[PDB]
Amino acid sequence: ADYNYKLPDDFMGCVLAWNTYKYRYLRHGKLRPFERD
Amino acid sequence: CTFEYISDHLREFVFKNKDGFLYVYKGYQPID
Ligand SMILES: *[C@@H]1O[C@H](CO)[C@@H](O)[C@H](O)[C@H]1NC(C)=O
């Protein structure tokens, strides 16, 4: 939720997950919501 | 790459960008 995938704080929607590949760890700055790098 | 969209005097535009959305506005005027 800091460098990979951010949600806004007015979210209208549903979040789903179930039990069943890299991920970023260093970048200069935060993210804006619903934006990718 | 991800997105694609093909569809069928002073010309004025406003481009705004927020929450991962690019809003585009448009005007037209028949006339520096
Ligand atoms: C947008 O991308 C630029 C790349 O030059 C970066 O400097 C900037 O920090 C990015 N925006 C945010 C909110 O991190």
Side-chain angles (χ1 to χ4, degrees), chain B residues 6-31:
Chain B
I6 303 183
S7 74
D8 199 23
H9 52 56
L10 171 78
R11 67 181 65 251
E12 311 163 272
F13 294 88
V14 163
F15 299 91
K16 199 173 69 173
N17 178 274
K18 64 182 301 303
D19 269 15
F21 274 100
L22 181 84
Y23 306 90
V24 177
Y25 299 87
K26 184 188 81 82
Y28 182 76
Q29 208 205 45
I31 62 170

Side-chain angles (χ1 to χ4, degrees), chain A residues 18-31:
Chain A
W18 69 99
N19 209 334
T20 302
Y21 289 167
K22 292 163 285 190
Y23 85 101
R24 193 162 291 257
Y25 189 65
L26 190 146
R27 89 181 285 269
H28 282 305
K30 283 263 172 203
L31 289 176

